[PDB]
PDB file of C-alpha atoms and ligand atoms in Angstrom:
ATOM      1  CA  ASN A   1     -46.869  73.755-127.637  1.00 28.19           C
ATOM      2  CA  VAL A   2     -43.549  74.966-126.355  1.00 31.88           C
ATOM      3  CA  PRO A   3     -40.717  74.931-129.010  1.00 32.59           C
ATOM      4  CA  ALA A   4     -37.652  73.475-127.585  1.00 33.29           C
ATOM      5  CA  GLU A   5     -35.240  76.075-128.931  1.00 35.31           C
ATOM      6  CA  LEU A   6     -36.997  79.370-127.878  1.00 37.96           C
ATOM      7  CA  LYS A   7     -36.518  81.587-124.935  1.00 34.70           C
ATOM      8  CA  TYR A   8     -39.471  82.414-123.201  1.00 37.62           C
ATOM      9  CA  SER A   9     -40.890  85.329-120.540  1.00 38.92           C
ATOM     10  CA  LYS A  10     -42.801  84.989-117.484  1.00 39.50           C
ATOM     11  CA  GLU A  11     -45.367  87.201-119.600  1.00 40.17           C
ATOM     12  CA  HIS A  12     -45.834  84.581-122.138  1.00 44.89           C
ATOM     13  CA  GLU A  13     -43.495  86.091-124.971  1.00 46.50           C
ATOM     14  CA  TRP A  14     -41.109  83.851-126.885  1.00 48.01           C
ATOM     15  CA  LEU A  15     -37.845  85.305-128.388  1.00 43.62           C
ATOM     16  CA  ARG A  16     -36.167  83.496-131.492  1.00 44.92           C
ATOM     17  CA  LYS A  17     -32.575  84.437-132.670  1.00 45.72           C
ATOM     18  CA  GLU A  18     -32.685  84.963-136.681  1.00 44.25           C
ATOM     19  CA  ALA A  19     -30.076  84.534-139.148  1.00 43.61           C
ATOM     20  CA  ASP A  20     -29.632  88.306-139.382  1.00 43.63           C
ATOM     21  CA  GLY A  21     -28.608  88.184-135.592  1.00 45.52           C
ATOM     22  CA  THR A  22     -31.815  90.049-134.836  1.00 42.69           C
ATOM     23  CA  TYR A  23     -34.538  88.637-132.448  1.00 40.47           C
ATOM     24  CA  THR A  24     -38.247  87.919-133.340  1.00 39.90           C
ATOM     25  CA  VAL A  25     -40.697  88.264-130.641  1.00 43.02           C
ATOM     26  CA  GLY A  26     -44.490  87.043-130.268  1.00 42.31           C
ATOM     27  CA  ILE A  27     -46.635  85.622-128.009  1.00 41.65           C
ATOM     28  CA  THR A  28     -46.950  81.648-126.980  1.00 38.23           C
ATOM     29  CA  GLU A  29     -49.401  79.184-127.723  1.00 39.23           C
ATOM     30  CA  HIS A  30     -50.791  79.286-124.347  1.00 38.71           C
ATOM     31  CA  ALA A  31     -50.997  83.183-124.563  1.00 39.08           C
ATOM     32  CA  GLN A  32     -53.090  83.150-127.631  1.00 40.88           C
ATOM     33  CA  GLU A  33     -55.406  80.570-125.901  1.00 42.14           C
ATOM     34  CA  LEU A  34     -55.793  82.482-123.007  1.00 39.71           C
ATOM     35  CA  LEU A  35     -56.918  85.509-124.814  1.00 39.27           C
ATOM     36  CA  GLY A  36     -59.044  83.963-127.460  1.00 42.34           C
ATOM     37  CA  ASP A  37     -59.958  85.300-130.736  1.00 44.08           C
ATOM     38  CA  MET A  38     -57.898  87.997-131.718  1.00 41.03           C
ATOM     39  CA  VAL A  39     -59.280  91.511-132.953  1.00 39.55           C
ATOM     40  CA  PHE A  40     -56.392  94.112-132.718  1.00 42.27           C
ATOM     41  CA  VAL A  41     -52.641  94.114-132.214  1.00 40.04           C
ATOM     42  CA  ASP A  42     -51.188  97.509-131.539  1.00 40.71           C
ATOM     43  CA  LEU A  43     -47.619  97.176-132.918  1.00 40.92           C
ATOM     44  CA  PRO A  44     -44.647  99.091-131.521  1.00 39.66           C
ATOM     45  CA  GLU A  45     -42.869 101.939-133.585  1.00 38.90           C
ATOM     46  CA  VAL A  46     -40.010 100.854-135.978  1.00 39.98           C
ATOM     47  CA  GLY A  47     -36.930 102.714-134.855  1.00 41.36           C
ATOM     48  CA  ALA A  48     -37.820 102.848-131.212  1.00 40.57           C
ATOM     49  CA  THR A  49     -35.572 102.279-128.559  1.00 38.88           C
ATOM     50  CA  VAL A  50     -36.757  99.877-125.694  1.00 40.68           C
ATOM     51  CA  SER A  51     -35.373  98.451-122.402  1.00 41.13           C
ATOM     52  CA  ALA A  52     -35.812  94.681-121.574  1.00 40.68           C
ATOM     53  CA  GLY A  53     -39.426  94.793-119.593  1.00 39.60           C
ATOM     54  CA  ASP A  54     -40.818  97.882-121.396  1.00 40.52           C
ATOM     55  CA  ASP A  55     -44.511  97.647-122.471  1.00 38.00           C
ATOM     56  CA  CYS A  56     -44.435  97.837-126.518  1.00 35.40           C
ATOM     57  CA  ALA A  57     -47.189  95.985-127.838  1.00 34.65           C
ATOM     58  CA  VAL A  58     -50.803  95.178-126.955  1.00 34.47           C
ATOM     59  CA  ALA A  59     -53.025  92.149-128.115  1.00 34.74           C
ATOM     60  CA  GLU A  60     -56.706  92.566-127.836  1.00 33.35           C
ATOM     61  CA  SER A  61     -59.297  89.809-128.343  1.00 33.91           C
ATOM     62  CA  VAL A  62     -63.140  89.723-128.498  1.00 33.19           C
ATOM     63  CA  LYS A  63     -62.845  89.143-124.333  1.00 31.73           C
ATOM     64  CA  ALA A  64     -59.501  90.212-123.255  1.00 29.10           C
ATOM     65  CA  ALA A  65     -56.599  92.445-123.533  1.00 27.50           C
ATOM     66  CA  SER A  66     -52.858  92.169-122.656  1.00 28.13           C
ATOM     67  CA  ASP A  67     -49.821  94.340-122.921  1.00 31.03           C
ATOM     68  CA  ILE A  68     -46.608  92.591-124.401  1.00 33.31           C
ATOM     69  CA  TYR A  69     -43.222  93.523-123.226  1.00 33.74           C
ATOM     70  CA  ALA A  70     -39.639  93.596-124.844  1.00 32.45           C
ATOM     71  CA  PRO A  71     -38.096  90.544-123.578  1.00 32.14           C
ATOM     72  CA  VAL A  72     -34.497  92.178-124.117  1.00 29.55           C
ATOM     73  CA  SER A  73     -33.426  95.757-124.536  1.00 31.82           C
ATOM     74  CA  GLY A  74     -32.577  97.197-128.050  1.00 31.96           C
ATOM     75  CA  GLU A  75     -33.973  98.822-131.282  1.00 26.82           C
ATOM     76  CA  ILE A  76     -37.084  97.693-132.901  1.00 23.80           C
ATOM     77  CA  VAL A  77     -36.217  97.031-136.208  1.00 25.47           C
ATOM     78  CA  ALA A  78     -39.385  95.665-137.814  1.00 26.28           C
ATOM     79  CA  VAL A  79     -42.987  95.080-136.886  1.00 25.44           C
ATOM     80  CA  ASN A  80     -45.445  92.496-138.523  1.00 22.32           C
ATOM     81  CA  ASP A  81     -47.678  94.714-140.618  1.00 24.62           C
ATOM     82  CA  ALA A  82     -49.854  91.871-141.678  1.00 23.55           C
ATOM     83  CA  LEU A  83     -51.272  91.772-138.052  1.00 21.12           C
ATOM     84  CA  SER A  84     -53.038  95.196-138.655  1.00 19.11           C
ATOM     85  CA  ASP A  85     -55.232  93.181-141.269  1.00 15.76           C
ATOM     86  CA  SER A  86     -55.108  89.751-139.834  1.00 15.98           C
ATOM     87  CA  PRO A  87     -54.408  89.650-136.048  1.00 16.47           C
ATOM     88  CA  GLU A  88     -55.886  86.261-135.936  1.00 15.37           C
ATOM     89  CA  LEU A  89     -52.436  85.103-137.504  1.00 16.48           C
ATOM     90  CA  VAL A  90     -51.463  85.403-133.625  1.00 21.47           C
ATOM     91  CA  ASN A  91     -54.088  82.761-132.732  1.00 22.02           C
ATOM     92  CA  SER A  92     -53.289  80.295-136.090  1.00 21.27           C
ATOM     93  CA  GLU A  93     -49.678  80.593-136.020  1.00 25.98           C
ATOM     94  CA  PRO A  94     -48.072  82.201-132.763  1.00 23.65           C
ATOM     95  CA  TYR A  95     -44.503  81.009-133.549  1.00 24.66           C
ATOM     96  CA  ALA A  96     -44.820  81.584-137.162  1.00 25.02           C
ATOM     97  CA  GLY A  97     -46.703  84.034-139.178  1.00 24.61           C
ATOM     98  CA  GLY A  98     -48.078  85.491-136.039  1.00 21.53           C
ATOM     99  CA  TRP A  99     -44.704  87.197-134.854  1.00 22.21           C
ATOM    100  CA  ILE A 100     -45.277  90.524-133.597  1.00 26.60           C
ATOM    101  CA  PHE A 101     -41.774  92.475-133.886  1.00 25.20           C
ATOM    102  CA  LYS A 102     -38.083  92.049-134.340  1.00 26.43           C
ATOM    103  CA  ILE A 103     -35.566  93.611-131.989  1.00 25.28           C
ATOM    104  CA  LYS A 104     -31.801  94.415-132.609  1.00 25.26           C
ATOM    105  CA  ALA A 105     -30.562  93.581-129.016  1.00 27.51           C
ATOM    106  CA  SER A 106     -28.239  95.944-127.147  1.00 22.99           C
ATOM    107  CA  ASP A 107     -27.118  93.587-124.591  1.00 23.66           C
ATOM    108  CA  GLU A 108     -27.132  89.836-125.298  1.00 26.34           C
ATOM    109  CA  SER A 109     -26.548  88.989-121.691  1.00 25.56           C
ATOM    110  CA  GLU A 110     -30.178  89.713-120.950  1.00 27.17           C
ATOM    111  CA  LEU A 111     -30.960  86.478-122.375  1.00 26.30           C
ATOM    112  CA  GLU A 112     -30.071  84.879-118.989  1.00 29.45           C
ATOM    113  CA  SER A 113     -33.102  86.666-117.493  1.00 30.33           C
ATOM    114  CA  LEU A 114     -35.452  84.646-119.848  1.00 26.71           C
ATOM    115  CA  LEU A 115     -36.788  81.351-119.357  1.00 27.11           C
ATOM    116  CA  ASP A 116     -35.671  78.303-121.282  1.00 26.09           C
ATOM    117  CA  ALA A 117     -38.480  75.838-122.474  1.00 23.04           C
ATOM    118  CA  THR A 118     -38.383  73.365-119.565  1.00 25.28           C
ATOM    119  CA  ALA A 119     -38.849  76.286-117.221  1.00 23.02           C
ATOM    120  CA  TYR A 120     -41.736  77.772-119.275  1.00 24.01           C
ATOM    121  CA  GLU A 121     -43.135  74.330-119.273  1.00 27.59           C
ATOM    122  CA  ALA A 122     -42.905  74.279-115.405  1.00 28.27           C
ATOM    123  CA  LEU A 123     -44.465  77.827-115.382  1.00 27.42           C
ATOM    124  CA  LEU A 124     -47.396  76.747-117.402  1.00 26.88           C
ATOM    125  CA  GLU A 125     -48.069  73.713-114.783  1.00 23.98           C
ATOM    126  CA  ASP A 126     -47.956  76.161-111.937  1.00 24.37           C
ATOM    127  CA  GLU A 127     -50.428  78.720-113.687  1.00 28.17           C
TER     128      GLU A 127
HETATM  129 CA1  LIG B 201     -48.642 101.117-132.211  1.00 25.25          CA
HETATM  130 CL1  LIG B 202     -47.042  78.244-134.895  1.00 23.82          CL
END
């Protein structure tokens, strides 16, 4: 399950441009499958300024945990508070209700450092 329109990181995040011009970030179907049943998501602080590649959230399952990185630089403008209660949304709806945070990008040329869907599919086959 690799939505054809998203951009992806090598750390298994996806990035979606929204109608308000901000970007939504979550983890992929593959990511949630690797982690298994979700227990806790540590969300970033709204208002925080991050550089592309900064660690800004953590996903923890019954068995494992991974850092989650800003795919682009910018300002965190929203976080999915639903995950505090229902982190399992990351398992059931990784591209939808399980989104993690939203960023107002400071340099959109950074999109060029992300993978397109076909590259992410290739990455999965090499893992
Ligand atoms: Ca936090
Ligand atoms: Cl989904």
